[PDB]
Amino acid sequence: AWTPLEPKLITRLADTVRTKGLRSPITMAEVEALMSSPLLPHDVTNLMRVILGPAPYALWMDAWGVQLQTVIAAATRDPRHPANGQGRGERTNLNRLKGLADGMVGNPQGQAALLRPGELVAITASALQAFREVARLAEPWADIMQGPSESFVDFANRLIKAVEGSDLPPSARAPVIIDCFRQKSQPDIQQLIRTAPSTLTTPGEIIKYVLDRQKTA
Amino acid sequence: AWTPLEPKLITRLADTVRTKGLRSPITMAEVEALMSSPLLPHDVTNLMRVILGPAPYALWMDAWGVQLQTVIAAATRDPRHPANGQGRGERTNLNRLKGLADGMVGNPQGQAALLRPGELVAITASALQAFREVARLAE
Amino acid sequence: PWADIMQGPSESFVDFANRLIKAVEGSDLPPSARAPVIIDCFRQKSQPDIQQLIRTAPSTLTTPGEIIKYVLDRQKTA
Amino acid sequence: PWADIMQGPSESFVDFANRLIKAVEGSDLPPSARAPVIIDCFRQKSQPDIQQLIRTAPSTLTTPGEIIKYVLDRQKTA
Amino acid sequence: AWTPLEPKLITRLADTVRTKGLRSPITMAEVEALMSSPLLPHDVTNLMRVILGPAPYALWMDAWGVQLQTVIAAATRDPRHPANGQGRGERTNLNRLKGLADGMVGNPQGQAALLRPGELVAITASALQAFREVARLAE
Amino acid sequence: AWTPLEPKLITRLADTVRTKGLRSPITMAEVEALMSSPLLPHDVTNLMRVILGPAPYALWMDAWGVQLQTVIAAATRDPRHPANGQGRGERTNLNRLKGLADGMVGNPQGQAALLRPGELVAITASALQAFREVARLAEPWADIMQGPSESFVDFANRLIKAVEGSDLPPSARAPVIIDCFRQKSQPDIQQLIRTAPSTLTTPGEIIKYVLDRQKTA
Amino acid sequence: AWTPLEPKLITRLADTVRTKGLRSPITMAEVEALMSSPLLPHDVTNLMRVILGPAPYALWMDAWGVQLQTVIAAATRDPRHPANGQGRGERTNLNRLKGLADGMVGNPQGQAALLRPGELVAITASALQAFREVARLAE
Amino acid sequence: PWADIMQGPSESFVDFANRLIKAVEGSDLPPSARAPVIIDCFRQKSQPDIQQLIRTAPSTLTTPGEIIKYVLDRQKTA
Amino acid sequence: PWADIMQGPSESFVDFANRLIKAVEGSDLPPSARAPVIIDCFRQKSQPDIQQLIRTAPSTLTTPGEIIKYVLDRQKTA
Amino acid sequence: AWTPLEPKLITRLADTVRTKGLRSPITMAEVEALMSSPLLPHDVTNLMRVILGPAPYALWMDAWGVQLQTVIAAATRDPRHPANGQGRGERTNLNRLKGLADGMVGNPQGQAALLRPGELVAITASALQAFREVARLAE
């Protein structure tokens, strides 16, 4: 049975997007919050219709379609997709993902009936990635320096944000974050990381080490 | 059957962490509240992704891994773990605890299917201890 | 009225696109005629700097979102 | 003479292409050397706006007809 | 036996294209008139060489090739094409459609000998569609 | 039979290192030239003794030892090393690699007798990597910009040099080089790469595309 | 038995490429000179690593791969390739041409052992054509 | 009183450690609470040069003797 | 004589290290006594700024190359 | 039966350490003198408590623990240790060496009862080596 999202939460999220913008970490946290339960294409479509303006909504429709197409390519590349089935009769077409298939157009109840939970979570992750792309597009990691007065956790937050919300492949983010911790992060912390008796091979480990041995001031 | 946590509660908890910080007793009480029912690795992972910033989230992933490794050492030190079974075929690997095992990666429904209640409570206690460590470390 | 919408001399492009998409989708056109109309209104409205920017597109833009992305990339920062 | 043909500052591109193809095909070149010469004359003549338009072609144009189509699509309406 | 089109009709059609343009309905009607009987690749090629300028002729060669390629894709998608035969030995290659096959290059008599009527009508329809495309593109 | 390297070539290489430095691309090319045939530990040791000063020579001995130790760890991790044999009696100890084993200390003829060609090429590659490390150490990729008047091949050469001669892991160099091509390389080439109808997933492909469609000037 | 090229000749060729450029006829003549005997993938790879800069070396790796792929397509189109054999067990894979096959990675002696003379001359001609392409492309 | 002991600007570190360990062991604390108190007093007293020297310890020092040895090794000779 | 080598007030550290390693390796010491002597000469020569820089090393340096690398990293640029 | 060391000798040794220092050869000779008969952990512990200051005493406790751990590693590496026995029930734990085992904590009489002569001489040699280390470290 389909239950709609509260218009009160949607109104609060819309005003959050209106005042803070699309890219603020609080806005992305709120979107992740309202993106907790797997939503039907109807829900996400109406949500983006309400919270986004017309032009960002067009951009988001484009990006969502592209991400869903990548998902369907991965699905035809692996018959063990949680949206797919074992036989060929359960293969998931883009009409079923975008809610355009038969028995789904405009009807959220029938949508919730025929859709799979794997389908729902794939649609939801696709919509979240598309929202991230459009937010990064509507309004550079290698230009980030730790200010003379800035703390280290703020610098790490800013750097990880800019590196993960960029055009790098997923397998190239951790080495870049590490090598940016080592070369940025003004020479006191640079020497603190350099003289590490242990080898730090993860951004979390570097952050923990620096937070332990940092110069309290 | 898997039911997600309310995004309203998650938004309220995120704003609590944003205003009060990670170490306030009210924040730890709220986390204990949202840590009441045994959560699947998917739930806790997304929860920490939403409520924590990027750097605290990295620290928390590290600490959670370490605590889960201690749990798995205690599990191989005692075949009577509520996550383990009696035979050797029920021994619980870290891929099954972190949600990385087969049939679980990215799918919360399959996760809830294959996981044990002892597995869930162990994962939950590990995540709570890791949150405590990171909160004590961040400030 | 959608056919009377022009991009003002001082107006940005995202505001013009928002206004145009709003007026086109909230009108009496069939659903299958909105995207071509939005594209052809981007091409003929949207004062001649952006008109020439869209005209000299080495790729073929076949969607309002793609046109918006291209224009936002290559727009004259001012 | 084909090697003396330039696109005038005010001349359109289809007139220039007509004149150039006429002078190249009605000349002393072998039949198998007309298309490469027409292409390389499109690239080096055809005043620098169209020169840069052909240079920045995401696709590789390997025929005078394809070059003409591309330029007619992405030309600066004026 | 191959019979050429009258140079008087071709001259009148060329002057029509010169004064009225490529896109006028009278010009398209005249082209449809001179496109009544199924023409051999030689005929259509020389006709477009005479009535069209150099640049429109290049565009038309491109468009004609593309349309013939679509026709050959439909032909390999259906063995019952009026240009095809039942066995695999009658499959029609683009060298036979564009007049480039063996025994046809430059010779209209041999062309008319080896070509099928279905081949001729397909070539003719392809050339007409290509002319329409180029006319819509030129102005 | 062992043949020594010409002292004329060694003198020319030493003067090259003296005038151009350790890190110039011409110096590295000359070292690669004199590093063409597989050298015995005696040859490389004397070569580095002659061309390098005392302190760079100490640094190079350290780095060479570390790289040889990594090689021996990989060798004990794979019994199919071209330096190893099939049985356990052919396992290669560091005394045999550094030329310290029995029948080799100070004698290049005996060295050439007992050493394997795989041993020689491994020693040579180790010495080359150690030279690169010491050269990078004796005298920043994220600060490299394409100058307003600089050509693109010079910028690409400089960037690839600084990225490969840095502290990044080997699996993180290509994504970093690509993302630096995209964000550096002044906005004309930035837009040229952005509007690529094909997806460029390799620095070589990006370089080829840009060289094809660049604005001749 | 594998014999390396003289570093003196390689240094002279590198300085020739440095002063005259990639496209001068003297440079191509010198490359043809050092491309006289059939080289192993190790030799050509190190030679191009030394004489070419980083970006031309990337371009050359790309072009060499493409040309070797064309060679392997011609090889699967003709079982009488001097690199191939008569039976199917001698078919030459790109791992064997690029030196990536088993028993060849990093070892020039084993390379020279398993490689065929036809393989060597095909690799050499491919590398020469790739060098020509990159030289025509760089300037 | 142990909680009032500071390392003077001119005092050496071994004298400060002697005084602090004396005052902590000759006090009313339980025996199981002396080592943590001595460590945390080394870290917060012992004027900021030695404070930063102990803070930036690549190893974890978990004993007053180890802290004393480390500081005596890496101290600023003056 | 190696035991008479001092780092001059204006001399850089790499020149001093070169001179010292040269004089120590080209002397009458056994081969197994050169590294400890070079280290202990780095520590006691090499005027008190670098002396204190080596003294306050959070890590233990057990090789002339490691000492040289550390000093080159943390040296006072001047 | 346990007999304590004379407080007169201990006072003289303490004043020797106070005037001559920890590293003088006369001080080491005096320590060797008072280290002649195998001492119980109680004796050596109180001796070092009296003759050494607080910080050298902490250093000495550390060094003594490390040396005793090396001894116990050698003991588990050889079942023929004069402190060990033949069966596994006589294996000597660090609680028995440091005097922390059951029936020994604070009681020198029970200590002397349960301890072996090999245990005593090993403890004594360990304490002497630890004293040497701390003396070399303090100045």
DSSP string, J46-87: HHHHHHS-HHHHHHHHHHHHHHHHHHHHHHHT-TT-TTS-SS
Please indicate whether, in this complex, the C-beta atoms of I21 and F57 are within 8 angstroms of each other.
yes
> What residues in J contact H63, CB-CB < 8 Å?
58, 62
Partner residue facing F54 (CB), from I18, I63, I66: I18
C58 touches chain F (CB under 8 A): yes
Contact F141, F162 (CB under 8 A): yes
Please indicate whether, in this complex, the C-beta atoms of G6 and F36 are within 8 angstroms of each other.
yes
Please indicate whether, in this complex, the C-beta atoms of F191 and C74 are within 8 angstroms of each other.
yes
Q: How far is Cα B61 from Cα B49, in angstroms, rounded to an integer?
A: 10
Q: How distant is the Cα of C27 from the closest Cα of chain D, in angstroms? A: 30
> What residues in F contact I72, CB-CB < 8 Å?
137-138
Selection from F157, F140, F130, F166 nearest residue F35 by Cα = F130
> What residues in C contact F195, CB-CB < 8 Å?
58-59, 70, 73-74
CB-hemisphere CA count at 13 Å for F5?
28
D68 touches chain E (CB under 8 A): yes
Name the phi and psi angles at A17, rounded to 5: -65, -30
Angle at alpha carbon of residue D52, lines to D51 and D58, rounded to 5°: 115
Q: How far is Cα E43 from Cα E49, in angstroms, rounded to an integer?
A: 10
Please indicate whether, in this complex, the C-beta atoms of F194 and C59 are within 8 angstroms of each other.
no
**Torsion angle (degrees, nearest 10) of CA J49, J50, J51, J54:** 50
A63 touches chain C (CB under 8 A): yes
Class of domain A141-213 as given by CATH: mainly alpha
> What residues in F contact A180, CB-CB < 8 Å?
142
Contact B24, B131 (CB under 8 A): no
Partner residue facing F182 (CB), from A167, A169, A184: A167
Tell me the resolution in Å: 7.2
> What residues in A contact C77, CB-CB < 8 Å?
none
* Secondary structure, 3-state, J8-37: HHHHHHHHHHHHHCCCCHHHHHHHHHHCCC
Interface of F with A in 26-45 (CB under 8 A): none
Q: How far is Cα G102 from Cα G83, in angstroms, rounded to an integer?
A: 17
CB-hemisphere CA count at 13 Å for A1?
1
F194 touches chain D (CB under 8 A): no
Q: How distant is the Cα of C15 from the closest Cα of chain A, in angstroms? A: 8
Return the H-helix or E-strand segment holding B97: helix B94-97
| Structure token digits, residue J130 | 């630890």
CB-hemisphere CA count at 13 Å for A12?
13
Q: Which of the following CATH numbers is that of domain C2-74: 1.10.150.130, 1.20.1250.20, 3.30.70.3270, 1.10.1200.30?
A: 1.10.1200.30
Q: How far is Cα B116 from Cα B75, in angstroms, rounded to an integer?
A: 14
CA F57 vs. chain centroid, Å, equals 17
Contacts of A42 (CB under 8 A, 6+ apart): A2, A99, A108, A111
Selection from F52, F50, F68 nearest residue F60 by Cα = F52
Name the phi and psi angles at G4, rounded to 5: -75, 155
Positive or negative torsion for Cα B50, B56, B61, B63:
negative
Q: How far is Cα J44 from Cα J49, in angstroms, rounded to an integer?
A: 8
| H55-58 LR contacts (CB < 8 Å, sep 24+) | H55/A213, H55/A214, H55/A215, H55/A216, H56/A192, H56/A195, H56/A213, H56/A215, H56/I58, H57/A213, H57/I58, H58/A195, H58/A196, H58/A197, H58/A198, H58/A213, H58/I58, H58/I59
The single residue listed with the structure tokens 């080491």 is J28
Q: How many CB pairs under 8 A join F and G?
A: 83
Selection from D27, D67, D60 nearest residue D44 by Cα = D67
A198 touches chain H (CB under 8 A): yes
> For F10, which DSSP code?
H
Selection from E27, I56, A148, F198 nearest residue I74 by Cα = I56
D57 touches chain F (CB under 8 A): yes
Contact J122, J130 (CB under 8 A): no
* Alpha helices (H) in A21-150, listed in sequence order: 25-34, 41-51, 54-76, 94-97, 108-114, 117-138
Partner residue facing F175 (CB), from A142, A172, A184: A172
Return the H-helix or E-strand segment holding E27: helix E25-34
Contacts of H4 (CB under 8 A, 6+ apart): none
Please indicate whether, in this complex, the C-beta atoms of I58 and A194 are within 8 angstroms of each other.
no
Burial (CB < 10 A; 0-12, 13-18, 19+), residue B37, is exposed
Please indicate whether, in this complex, the C-beta atoms of A179 and F166 are within 8 angstroms of each other.
yes
| F164-168 LR contacts (CB < 8 Å, sep 24+) | F164/G54, F165/F23, F165/F132, F165/F135, F165/F136, F166/A179, F166/F136, F166/F141, F167/A179, F167/A182, F168/A175, F168/A179, F168/F141
Q: What is the biggest distance separating any 2 CA atoms in chain B, rounded to whole angstroms?
A: 49
Q: How far is Cα H3 from Cα H17, in angstroms, rounded to an integer?
A: 13
Please indicate whether, in this complex, the C-beta atoms of F194 and C58 are within 8 angstroms of each other.
no
**Torsion angle (degrees, nearest 10) of CA A156, A159, A163, A165:** 100
Q: How far is Cα B98 from Cα B64, in angstroms, rounded to an integer?
A: 9
D58 touches chain C (CB under 8 A): yes
Q: How distant is the Cα of C59 from the closest Cα of chain F, in angstroms? A: 7
Q: How far is Cα I48 from Cα H78, in angstroms, rounded to an integer?
A: 10
Q: Where does F1-138 sit in CATH, by number?
A: 1.10.375.10
List C-alpha distances in Å: J36 to G125, I16, J5, J121: 86, 51, 11, 10
Residue of D nearest to F199 (CA): D58
Contact D7, D48 (CB under 8 A): no
Residue of A nearest to C63 (CA): A62
Contact C42, C17 (CB under 8 A): yes
Query: CATH 1.10.375.10 in chain A, residues?
Result: 1-138
Q: How distant is the Cα of D29 from the closest Cα of chain C, in angstroms? A: 32
Q: How far is Cα F62 from Cα F40, in angstroms, rounded to an integer?
A: 18
> What residues in A contact F136, CB-CB < 8 Å?
none
Q: How far apart are the first and last CA of chain E?
A: 38
Q: How far is Cα A54 from Cα B101, in angstroms, rounded to an integer?
A: 42
> What residues in D contact F212, CB-CB < 8 Å?
60
Positive or negative torsion for Cα J17, J23, J25, J28:
positive
- At residue F215, the 3 state secondary structure works out as coil
> What residues in A contact C14, CB-CB < 8 Å?
55, 138
Q: How far is Cα J139 from Cα J125, in angstroms, rounded to an integer?
A: 22
- CB neighbourhood size of J133 (10 A): 17
Partner residue facing A121 (CB), from B11, B18, B107: B107
The single residue listed with the structure tokens 């995207």 is C35
The chains found to touch A (3+ Cβ pairs under 8 angstroms) are: B, C, F, H, I
**Torsion angle (degrees, nearest 10) of CA G125, G126, G129, G135:** -120
